[PDB]
């Protein structure tokens, strides 16, 4: 069995905010495929083991695009459990010195315009700083 | 020593009762699993002892219907106990399962629709009850 979900997001390209379509193809054995379209044109595709990883691979391919999504925010990251159980669709919005709480959970493709003009590496490095701030 | 833990998933029980839960990679480092279980791919499956903590994940944030799976195993590591105050998401009450969960050890599945309401009966794994 293969599941297919779809989701519209906003992206910034050349200073022009435009609407994109995401297709999420979840196939057997934790294969997640993320496709992104604009007006029926496929802009990119990434394949990975969860959708947060897929999203990061997607933003790395399209470095000229700002993705107005929680999943791109510098301080959003999944837990091991949210990555594992929700295929990375659910993640946490973290704050330095505070552990992640249920009320901090977000959908990685919900809208966000703040702190999203950053690379996947900057996001991942903030997450290590957050993790180390809990002691 | 055997414990009951729970796991949410949108994947159907036919697929899960057959294939169990597999891990992403060989890393048996529990601290690195908690920091980021994709880098390196960790050798643990996440479960929880609190069934209510599966609902959000099983429904992909209230967007989809899904299932809460119930398991019985004896090799899990209590993440809050192992990490203590460094535990990054201690409210999840996570039990990490080294090596994964065999299909045989998944006892049943309970449906949950998108608004978080679960069915009032548990579907049995035929691998154990069929």
């Amino acid at each position: 069995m293969t599941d297919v979900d779809k989701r519209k997001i906003k992206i910034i390209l050349n200073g022009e905010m435009e609407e994109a379509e995401l297709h999420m193809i979840t196939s057997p054995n934790r294969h997640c495929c993320l496709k992104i379209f604009h007006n029926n044109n496929q802009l990119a595709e990434s394949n990975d083991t969860d959708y947060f990883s897929c999203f990061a691979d997607l933003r790395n391919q399209l470095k000229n695009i700002i993705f107005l999504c929680k999943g791109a925010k510098i301080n959003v990251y999944p837990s091991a459990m949210s990555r594992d159980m929700s295929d990375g669709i659910v993640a946490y919005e973290t704050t330095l010195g505070q552990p992640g709480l249920p009320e901090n959970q977000v959908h990685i493709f919900d809208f966000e315009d703040k702190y999203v003009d950053i690379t996947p590496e900057e996001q991942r490095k903030f997450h290590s700083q957050w993790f180390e701030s809990l002691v | 020593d055997y414990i009951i833990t729970y796991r949410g998933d949108t994947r159907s029980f036919t697929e899960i009762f057959d294939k169990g839960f597999e891990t992403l990679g060989p890393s048996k480092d529990l601290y690195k699993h908690a920091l980021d279980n994709r880098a390196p791919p960790s050798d643990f499956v996440s479960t929880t002892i609190d069934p209510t903590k599966t609902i959000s994940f099983a429904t992909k944030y209230g967007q989809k219907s899904g299932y809460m799976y119930t398991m019985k195993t004896n090799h899990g590591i209590d993440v809050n106990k192992a990490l203590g105050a460094r535990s990054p998401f201690a409210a999840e009450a996570e039990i990490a399962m080294p090596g994964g969960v065999r299909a045989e050890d998944i006892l049943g599945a309970r449906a949950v629709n998108a608004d978080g309401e679960m069915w009032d009966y548990t579907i049995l794994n035929p691998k154990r009850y069929g």
């Binding site: - | 069934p51 009032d120 009966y121 548990t122 049995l124 069929g130």
Partner: protein, 107 residues
């Protein structure tokens, strides 16, 4: 409590199929929230309906052979037996009042 029959796969035909009077069989497992939820409700019903009904329990973890024979694929499942035949079926958790409604409508 002291009136509930504690079944095993081996004792099922004797204590259910060859029993006299109506037998309510609870298919259950210790790891099931809805199963544990109806547990003390069945103790109440076992006393209130004494002389009209026998309440029995089959734990499917210790007794994995019986439920498949009755097409039982979920728990909790209550089967009402009369003279060796299934007379009614109720699947899933329910309250004391809902359970008494199901019983009064089938006895």
């Amino acid at each position: 409590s002291d009136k509930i029959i504690h079944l095993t796969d081996d004792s099922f035909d004797t204590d259910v199929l060859k029993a006299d009077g109506a037998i309510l069989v609870d298919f259950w497992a210790e790891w099931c929230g809805p199963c544990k939820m109806i547990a003390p409700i069945l103790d109440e019903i076992a006393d209130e309906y004494q002389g009209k009904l026998t309440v029995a329990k089959l734990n499917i973890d210790q007794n994995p052979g019986t439920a498949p024979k009755y097409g039982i694929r979920g728990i909790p499942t209550l089967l009402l037996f009369k003279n060796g035949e299934v007379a009614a079926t109720k699947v899933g958790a329910l309250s004391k009042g809902q359970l008494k409604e199901f019983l009064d409508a089938n006895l």
